[PDB]
Amino acid sequence: GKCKDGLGEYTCTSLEGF
Amino acid sequence: KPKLLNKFDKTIKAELDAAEKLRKRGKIEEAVNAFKELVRKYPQSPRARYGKAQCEDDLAEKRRSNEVLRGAIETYQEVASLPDVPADLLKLSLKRRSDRQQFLGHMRGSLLTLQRLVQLFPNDTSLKNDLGVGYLLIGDNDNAKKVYEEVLSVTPNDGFAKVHYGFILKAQNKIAESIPYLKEGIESGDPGTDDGRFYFHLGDAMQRVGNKEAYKWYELGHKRGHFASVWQRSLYNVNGLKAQPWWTPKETGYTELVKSLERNWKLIRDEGLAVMDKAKGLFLPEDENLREKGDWSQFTLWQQGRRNENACKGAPKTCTLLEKFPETTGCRRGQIKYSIMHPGTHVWPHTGPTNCRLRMHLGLVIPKEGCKIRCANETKTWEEGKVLIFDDSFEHEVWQDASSFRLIFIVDVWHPELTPQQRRSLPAI
Numbered sequence A: 001g002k003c004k005d006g007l008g009e010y011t012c013t014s015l016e017g018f
Numbered sequence B: 001k002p003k004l005l006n007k008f009d010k011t012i013k014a015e016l017d018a019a020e021k022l023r024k025r026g027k028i029e030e031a032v033n034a035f036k037e038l039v040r041k042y043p044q045s046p047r048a049r050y051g052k053a054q055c056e057d058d059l060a061e062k063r064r065s066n067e068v069l070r071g072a073i074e075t076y077q078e079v080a081s082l083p084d085v086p087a088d089l090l091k092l093s094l095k096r097r098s099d100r101q102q103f104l105g106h107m108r109g110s111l112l113t114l115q116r117l118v119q120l121f122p123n124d125t126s127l128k129n130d131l132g133v134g135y136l137l138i139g140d141n142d143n144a145k146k147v148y149e150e151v152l153s154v155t156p157n158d159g160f161a162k163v164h165y166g167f168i169l170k171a172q173n174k175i176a177e178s179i180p181y182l183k184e185g186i187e188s189g190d191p192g193t194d195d196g197r198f199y200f201h202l203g204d205a206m207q208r209v210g211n212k213e214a215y216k217w218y219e220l221g222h223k224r225g226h227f228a229s230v231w232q233r234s235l236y237n238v239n240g241l242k243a244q245p246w247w248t249p250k251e252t253g254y255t256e257l258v259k260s261l262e263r264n265w266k267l268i269r270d271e272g273l274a275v276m277d278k279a280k281g282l283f284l285p286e287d288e289n290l291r292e293k294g295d296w297s298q299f300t301l302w303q304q305g306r307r308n309e310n311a312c313k314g315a316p317k318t319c320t321l322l323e324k325f326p327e328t329t330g331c332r333r334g335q336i337k338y339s340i341m342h343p344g345t346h347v348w349p350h351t352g353p354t355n356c357r358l359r360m361h362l363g364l365v366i367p368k369e370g371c372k373i374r375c376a377n378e379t380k381t382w383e384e385g386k387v388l389i390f391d392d393s394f395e396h397e398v399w400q401d402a403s404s405f406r407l408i409f410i411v412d413v414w415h416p417e418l419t420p421q422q423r424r425s426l427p428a429i
């Protein structure tokens, strides 16, 4: 689930550590 | 304040404190080795094991190392494996394990840890709430909803659970139902409720149902620092970038890109029309719940700075043309896509996620009447072969009340005031 046009996901970025 | 020492650890409290002293003084390497020594000599000590884990955690911060952190994550688990672990220490250790697993993106791992935590501390509401967040972070909204329903069946006025339950309702398009939860949750002031996502979605839910008070929530959300302004409500920002709803080509500095789009617009048009005629499944329905009614689909060539190679087979000349323009093809917080909208469509007022991009629209097939776009307090129209540019972190709204289809080409670019350094570093959206 990606935030393309809106802000509908709980988080829009991906977690990849440091 | 927390009781971290079991019977045996009290008997070695002086060695344990000596090791912890080293860590708080920032001598991490000496501290790691001190706790390793303690672990060797007392391999059943929960406090020694946790100390080893905490040093590894600090060391991972020092070295900014995921591999070292994975080591800490396992050591936090070892603490829980040991005999006779005090409850406060068990909870601290497994909580930290889950938090660091999420930081690494091991969301399924975190979820198992959180399920363990809830099994171990069945009366701890905060941990059930944390479990719901674990489910939300892997996209499992069905399970998250069940979690907050359980929390609310026992503590009906838990504000964290309310705002999260409202968030989920809103995401399922249960607009009216979500409003009281979002609003009561925020008003609770409970920890975790003063978050821009909940102001954002309460105001939006209110707008959709015609509630005049939406902007009071936007105003409060701006007062509390979540929104750059009442009109610009994105949540993934670089502070300081110039904020304007409408931009001219010259203001952006991407004049060569605008010239190429306008000089070559008919080839871009024609490939879109060919896909509409012969490959219509490449156009995919908008799926972020942004339509009140009607039909709106997009055919995406780049997303997150990555070319879709199958899609570009359908618009090969357009993709070739755009490759000369890294300000859009390497915009990892925007897209490049065709956008078709048909009569009878109304797109809800909405905001994009980030102020780090600007959005270009090139008109391709624009009916003479019935189509318009508002950004903040100004409405405009499209023209065939002409580019409009707006900042879609500002609230914007679109109508399609023509008697035939309307096709545009959308090209996102990095906000011009972002340095090459930020453009390489910001995480993709």
Ligand SMILES: C[C@H](CC(=O)O)C(=O)C(=O)O
Pocket: A005, B339, B340, B341, B347, B359, B373, B392, B396, B397, B398, B408, B410
């Ligand atoms: C509705 C518009 C797209 C369009 O008019 O096709 C929009 O929200 C956006 O470009 O960000």
Ligand SMILES: [Mn+2]
Pocket: A005, B350, B351, B352, B392, B396
């Ligand atoms: Mn939009």
